[PDB]
Design a protein around this nucleic acid. Structure first.
Ligand SMILES: [Mg+2]
Ligand SMILES: [Mg+2]
Ligand SMILES: [Mg+2]
Ligand SMILES: [Mg+2]
Ligand SMILES: [Mg+2]
Ligand SMILES: [Mg+2]
Ligand SMILES: [Mg+2]
Ligand SMILES: [Mg+2]
Ligand SMILES: [Mg+2]
Ligand SMILES: [Mg+2]
Ligand SMILES: [Mg+2]
Ligand SMILES: [Mg+2]
Ligand SMILES: [Mg+2]
Ligand SMILES: [Mg+2]
Ligand SMILES: [Mg+2]
Ligand SMILES: [Mg+2]
Ligand SMILES: [Mg+2]
Ligand SMILES: [Mg+2]
Ligand SMILES: [Mg+2]
Ligand SMILES: [Mg+2]
Ligand SMILES: [Mg+2]
Ligand SMILES: [Mg+2]
Ligand SMILES: [Mg+2]
Ligand SMILES: [Mg+2]
Ligand SMILES: [Mg+2]
Ligand SMILES: [Mg+2]
Ligand SMILES: [Mg+2]
Ligand SMILES: [Mg+2]
Ligand SMILES: [Mg+2]
Ligand SMILES: [Mg+2]
Ligand SMILES: [Mg+2]
Ligand SMILES: [Mg+2]
Ligand SMILES: [Mg+2]
Ligand SMILES: [Mg+2]
Ligand SMILES: [Mg+2]
Ligand SMILES: [Mg+2]
Ligand SMILES: [Mg+2]
Ligand SMILES: [Mg+2]
Ligand SMILES: [Mg+2]
Ligand SMILES: [Mg+2]
Ligand SMILES: [Mg+2]
Ligand SMILES: [Mg+2]
Ligand SMILES: [Mg+2]
Ligand SMILES: [Mg+2]
Ligand SMILES: [Mg+2]
Ligand SMILES: [Mg+2]
Ligand SMILES: [Mg+2]
Ligand SMILES: [Mg+2]
Ligand SMILES: [Mg+2]
Ligand SMILES: [Mg+2]
Ligand SMILES: [Mg+2]
Ligand SMILES: [Mg+2]
Ligand SMILES: [Mg+2]
Ligand SMILES: [Mg+2]
Ligand SMILES: [Mg+2]
Ligand SMILES: [Mg+2]
Ligand SMILES: [Mg+2]
Ligand SMILES: [Mg+2]
Ligand SMILES: [Mg+2]
Ligand SMILES: [Mg+2]
Ligand SMILES: [Mg+2]
Ligand SMILES: [Mg+2]
Ligand SMILES: [Mg+2]
Ligand SMILES: [Mg+2]
Ligand SMILES: [Mg+2]
Ligand SMILES: [Mg+2]
Ligand SMILES: [Mg+2]
Ligand SMILES: [Mg+2]
Ligand SMILES: [Mg+2]
Ligand SMILES: [Mg+2]
Ligand SMILES: [Mg+2]
Ligand SMILES: [Mg+2]
Ligand SMILES: [Mg+2]
Ligand SMILES: [Mg+2]
Ligand SMILES: [Mg+2]
Ligand SMILES: [Mg+2]
Ligand SMILES: [Mg+2]
Ligand SMILES: [Mg+2]
Ligand SMILES: [Mg+2]
Ligand SMILES: [Mg+2]
Ligand SMILES: [Mg+2]
Ligand SMILES: [Mg+2]
Ligand SMILES: [Mg+2]
Lengths: 119, 55, 123, 207, 113
RNA sequence: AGGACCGAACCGACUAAUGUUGAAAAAUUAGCGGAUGACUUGUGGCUGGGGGUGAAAGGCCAAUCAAACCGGGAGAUAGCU
RNA sequence: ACACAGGUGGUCAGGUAGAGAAUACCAAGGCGCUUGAGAGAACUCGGGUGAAGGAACUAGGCAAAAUGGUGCCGUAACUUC
RNA sequence: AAUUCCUUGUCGGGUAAGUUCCGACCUGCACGAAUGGCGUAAUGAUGGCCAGGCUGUCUCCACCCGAGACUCAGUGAAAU
RNA sequence: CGAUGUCGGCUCAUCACAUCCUGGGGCUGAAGUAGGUCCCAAGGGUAUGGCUGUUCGCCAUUUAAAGUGGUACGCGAGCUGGGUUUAGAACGUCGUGAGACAGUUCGGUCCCUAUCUGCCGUGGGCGCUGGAGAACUGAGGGGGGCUGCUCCUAGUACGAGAGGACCGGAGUGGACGCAUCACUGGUGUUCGGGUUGUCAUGCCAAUGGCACUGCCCGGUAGCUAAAUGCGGAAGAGAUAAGUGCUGAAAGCAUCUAAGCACGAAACUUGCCCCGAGAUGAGUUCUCCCUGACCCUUUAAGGGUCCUGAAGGAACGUUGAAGACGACGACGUUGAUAGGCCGGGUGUGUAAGCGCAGCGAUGCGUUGAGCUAACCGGUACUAAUGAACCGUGAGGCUUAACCU
């Protein structure tokens, strides 16, 4: 049973779950605030925060490593250029989960997840 | 796997006694934008704990 | 961890080569046997001119298991082959005079002094 | 009487022999006594103990008034131990860990780790049917739970699926290995109930 | 917890050397035959090193008259006395369990320099 | 060369599991047999009910066959329910 | 009977390995299978791995597991050659 | 023996143990010569048995991945 | 017969005593050991395989013993379907023939979403006579009970010998059960690495996708068993069969009619667990509410204004708690979760550069890089100031203290 385990399964096999997590992280880095369901964003916390922690020290090895994590040169360059110095002086916790109601088609409890240095 | 007699409307009402809903207790009225929302939920205009976060 | 229908090899020069356990002795629903345990074996194969014939039934003490035995510290001693030392059916002494391979220290008692004295090593 | 410890973790103790002992580390703080019950007031001879320290803004006013009239610091719970005849405990006393400076065996009682809605094979140690040889939709189901038409009832206490564990269970006569009067530890040998952070009542042994 | 680590480091040993999995090791341990604490010498390669602090272990495997013998020594136990490294081996792995299905010439290891 | 060999199309249907008020009034999945022949298939024709056709099982003849289906004799008859 | 995992004959047949129209990834192209969100209990279905033992299971090695290719060495009893 | 009741006939091999298997004995209830007898290399999604390899088939199950089951929202049957 | 599915195996069992072991005895053609037979006793325990469809059996080998029966020859709305008892086929025999054979081989669909009772778990309502939070006592129920071997007593008693005790004491095992992850290990499709084919990131380099996690190799936490802790008791009560002491009806005798003592794994207890819905609703402790009127049918009555306590509930962050409820922790006066920092473990020398070789590759940087669930810390984000249910001294009759 689920004693001391961590990581929501989210009704998806593992290849699909990892691929949608890096896709949602790319969408968050581009559009700077996204709106998704609540457990998807609660799992996106511990995925999009290691990218910014990795890019808080800029180097070629960490830049290729974030290219492995996100598979996109735009997300990599936007990270290491703008989301590095903006959250330089920030000891973790770069996202701000805001619950916002429900989705009208399947009653999924929605959530607006943004970066804290948004505005 | 199938029933033996027809159950009364008494038994059907007694079983349905639990499936009735409970209401939302009380909506939090925000202090600085005067509108109702759920607890810990952002409103329709976009306020939550005072400040407008969203477009 | 030796069951019925295991196929032990033989760690003495008594004559057998590949023996098969048939009944562990000691209790009802006795499942396994560690080392230093008396089982009953049949003999599948022999050296041609030996003390034992193929198709007999005689007791044997297990001396080496692949599961290993836990010391009172935790040092378990795996081997690479389940072995045994043949015995007699009534008197229960080892039939052979010379033991191949190593032997554990679990075997040392009042009972198996011949086997622990005739082993080359004790591990 | 006993103590109310909190099971920290399990580890080894080595001796100079070379043996290895599975040792559970029950930390035991100074157990405060809150209320001593006798025959004419209450109905039996038994004391009430408490440990730890709860938040002031989490202890409610009945509990806080109870502790403040009792005269001790606001603990974290309550437990009640019977008094064998020959013990007169004061209401302000604070039972230390050196109570076990003489015993060899203790009896440890705690909440076992709840394993869910465990089935029959996990719970009551049933067996299975075959995984091949024709067997269809019945690899681990219970099986026949009664007889034909007489009884015509499943007998009470029939072994079935339910919630395994999360129940007070007690292990009897574990040997105490060490009493640390400095670190406030009781080092026993074996496998006490409960996970890390469980509350265990440790009593001196009966058998 | 820190309490377990306190009780752990108060009786963990102090002179554990730098054996790497592959470096062949001769261990002198305390065997009691009758009533005599003597030493036995178990020498062989080290195929599995496990670190959990006081619960650490290493699995020395040798060939003692054809029948190979593994033995998982508990490191900080006082039933071992001496650990020595005969030669410095070097594999590109960390737990050499592939050595079991090889014998003789096909289970040597290139030396570390 | 072959009613030869191993094997995809294509024809099947040997075993197992899943379904069986299913996705399906016989199927899916994983394996399986033949796969240049007594093969298989498109399109049109032919044989009509005591009749057809049958490498033969009383099989097939429109989800029906120890004698089809539709109408008529016909409100057959029924010492039976 | 259904916007039904079923059935249906011809023509066109790219890249990389491959013997191949198998197979794996692809291009052009086309789609994501008309209910979703959680939680990660029993139990069931499709699967993966497993100590030590290896048919002891059982009606029965049913099912699974293994063996698998190209070139060379080699090959018995029997035989209608 | 696909024919055999008594019958698990008897003897031998195989196995520690073999109502099945294989080889003989003939006492063929009730085989038998084109409704064929007896042989037989090849062939068999065929029948019976043994052995090597292999393995959760099992001693004894344990964990893990997914689809259901369970909870919320929508639509919503059935045999009885 | 407008149907109750019929042998055997698996899985679950439960009961009886006409007992197979273990417990207690009486007799013995009982020296000891091993026994024979009879009486009390059902708490536990009661085998693996070969052949057959088997139950049964025979056999091999253990065991303390491998109980005898019921329970629809228990159990197919739980499971094979080998046999029996469908349609194919054949052999012997019968019948001229269609066909038949408790004769024989070969092959042959086992459906169901649980309404009610039952049972295993877990909740909502209200009650318990003011309300709320805690601990309890225990009426009553359940669980558990098995035993081998070795040694001491002691080769003593006994016996001519061989052999070999009773009673008691100690250890070490089997089977069963509970607990746990510290050890040995398994798993560990979320960690690390190798590697095949191919596609893509313009290309080399480095990486990612896809092929059951592509195939392997290790493996953290967690769950686990083969792994390691523990259990069964001791003792007390009343006893069964049996043994008695004293003792008369019956001057003797007599275990019994008066009286008393001993006596079993059986029953009540002792050990573990549930447990005040135990409506017989118990006990103790703590905390909180100390305001106004208005009315008629005066009542344990209704309505209005102010008040809203103790606490609960809701919401949120969640948990070694969990199907959903429930239980537990926490809500800025804060470590609950995520992040972050340090660590630990895992994998096993990353990238980039430089050197060496023709080149694959090696060397130096390098035990480097990466590191899920673990450990100790840090408010960086998220756990909002509220609003909501709950009220405002708690009836009558008697009795005891008070004045
Ligand atoms: Mg966690
Ligand atoms: Mg879903
Ligand atoms: Mg994949
Ligand atoms: Mg009726
Ligand atoms: Mg309902
Ligand atoms: Mg749980
Ligand atoms: Mg089984
Ligand atoms: Mg079925
Ligand atoms: Mg199945
Ligand atoms: Mg029934
Ligand atoms: Mg009745
Ligand atoms: Mg051909
Ligand atoms: Mg197919
Ligand atoms: Mg072919
Ligand atoms: Mg006609
Ligand atoms: Mg016919
Ligand atoms: Mg038809
Ligand atoms: Mg007709
Ligand atoms: Mg009519
Ligand atoms: Mg007429
Ligand atoms: Mg559709
Ligand atoms: Mg279609
Ligand atoms: Mg192609
Ligand atoms: Mg293809
Ligand atoms: Mg699942
Ligand atoms: Mg497998
Ligand atoms: Mg295995
Ligand atoms: Mg492995
Ligand atoms: Mg293995
Ligand atoms: Mg066999
Ligand atoms: Mg068998
Ligand atoms: Mg069997
Ligand atoms: Mg098969
Ligand atoms: Mg396979
Ligand atoms: Mg016969
Ligand atoms: Mg014979
Ligand atoms: Mg014959
Ligand atoms: Mg005949
Ligand atoms: Mg004939
Ligand atoms: Mg003739
Ligand atoms: Mg056989
Ligand atoms: Mg619904
Ligand atoms: Mg009938
Ligand atoms: Mg009827
Ligand atoms: Mg009796
Ligand atoms: Mg007698
Ligand atoms: Mg009984
Ligand atoms: Mg009874
Ligand atoms: Mg019976
Ligand atoms: Mg009967
Ligand atoms: Mg029956
Ligand atoms: Mg009968
Ligand atoms: Mg049956
Ligand atoms: Mg039934
Ligand atoms: Mg049949
Ligand atoms: Mg027929
Ligand atoms: Mg008949
Ligand atoms: Mg129900
Ligand atoms: Mg309730
Ligand atoms: Mg009781
Ligand atoms: Mg572990
Ligand atoms: Mg651990
Ligand atoms: Mg491991
Ligand atoms: Mg793995
Ligand atoms: Mg593990
Ligand atoms: Mg690639
Ligand atoms: Mg490249
Ligand atoms: Mg792709
Ligand atoms: Mg007693
Ligand atoms: Mg007298
Ligand atoms: Mg007298
Ligand atoms: Mg008495
Ligand atoms: Mg007893
Ligand atoms: Mg008793
Ligand atoms: Mg603080
Ligand atoms: Mg934290
Ligand atoms: Mg390390
Ligand atoms: Mg790399
Ligand atoms: Mg490098
Ligand atoms: Mg170096
Ligand atoms: Mg490292
Ligand atoms: Mg770290
Ligand atoms: Mg911490």
């Amino acid at each position: 049973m689920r004693h001391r385990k961590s990581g929501r399964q989210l009704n998806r096999n593992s290849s699909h779950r990892q691929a949608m997590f890096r896709n949602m992280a790319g969408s968050l880095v581009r559009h700077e605030i996204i709106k998704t369901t609540l457990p998807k964003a609660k799992e996106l916390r511990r995925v999009v925060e290691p990218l910014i922690t990795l890019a808080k020290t800029d180097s070629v090895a960490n830049r290729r490593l974030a290219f492995a994590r996100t598979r996109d040169n735009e997300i990599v360059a936007k990270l290491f250029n703008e989301l590095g110095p903006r959250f330089a002086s920030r000891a973790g916790g770069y996202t701000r989960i805001l619950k916002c109601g429900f989705r009208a088609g399947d009653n999924a409890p929605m959530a607006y997840i943004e970066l804290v240095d948004r505005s | 796997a199938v029933q033996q007699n027809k159950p009364t409307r008494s038994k059907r009402g007694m079983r349905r006694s639990h499936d009735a809903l409970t209401a939302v207790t009380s909506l939090s009225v925000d202090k600085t934008s005067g509108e109702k929302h759920l607890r810990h939920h952002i409103t329709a205009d976009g306020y939550y704990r005072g400040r407008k976060v969203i477009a | 961890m030796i069951q019925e229908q295991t196929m032990l090899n033989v760690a003495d020069n008594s004559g057998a080569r590949r023996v098969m356990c048939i009944k562990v002795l000691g209790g009802s629903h006795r499942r396994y046997a560690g080392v230093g345990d008396i089982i009953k074996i049949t003999i599948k194969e022999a050296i041609p001119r030996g003390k034992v014939k193929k198709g007999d039934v005689l007791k044997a003490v297990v001396v080496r298991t692949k599961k290993g035995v836990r010391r009172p510290d935790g040092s378990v001693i795996r081997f690479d082959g389940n072995a045994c030392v043949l015995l007699n059916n009534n008197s229960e002494q080892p039939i052979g005079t010379r033991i191949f391979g190593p032997v554990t220290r679990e075997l040392r008692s009042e009972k198996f002094m011949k086997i622990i004295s005739l082993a080359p090593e004790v591990l | 009487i006993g103590l109310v410890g909190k099971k920290v973790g399990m580890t080894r103790i080595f001796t100079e022999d070379g043996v290895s002992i599975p040792v559970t580390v029950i930390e035991v703080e100074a157990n405060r006594v809150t209320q001593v019950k006798d025959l004419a007031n209450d109905g039996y001879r038994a004391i009430q103990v408490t440990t730890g320290a709860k938040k002031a803004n989490r202890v409610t006013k009945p509990e806080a008034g109870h502790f403040a009239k009792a005269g001790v610091e606001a603990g974290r719970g309550l437990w009640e131990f019977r008094l064998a005849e020959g013990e007169e405990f004061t209401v302000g006393q604070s039972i230390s860990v050196e109570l076990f400076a003489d015993v060899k065996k203790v009896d440890v009682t705690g909440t076992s780790k709840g394993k869910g809605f465990a089935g029959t094979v996990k719970r009551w140690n049933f067996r299975t049917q075959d995984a091949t040889h024709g067997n269809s939709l019945s690899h681990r189901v219970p099986g026949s739970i009664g007889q034909n038409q007489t009884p015509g009832k499943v007998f009470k206490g029939k072994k079935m699926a339910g919630q395994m564990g999360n129940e007070r269970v007690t292990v009897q006569s574990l040997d105490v290995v060490r009493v640390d009067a400095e670190r406030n530890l009781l080092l026993v040998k074996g496998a006490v109930p409960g996970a890390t952070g469980s509350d265990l009542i440790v009593k001196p042994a009966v058998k | 917890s820190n309490i377990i680590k306190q009780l752990e480091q108060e009786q963990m040993k102090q002179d554990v050397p730098s054996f790497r999995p592959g470096d062949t090791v001769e261990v002198k341990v305390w065997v009691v035959e009758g009533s005599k604490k003597r030493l036995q010498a178990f020498e062989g390669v080290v195929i599995a090193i496990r670190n959990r602090g006081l619960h650490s272990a290493f699995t020395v495997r040798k060939i003692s008259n054809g029948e190979g013998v593994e033995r998982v020594f508990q490191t900080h136990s006082p039933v071992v006395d001496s650990i020595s490294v005969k030669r410095r081996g070097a594999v590109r792995k960390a737990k050499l369990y592939y050595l079991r299905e090889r014998t003789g010439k096909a289970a040597r290891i290139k030396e570390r320099l």
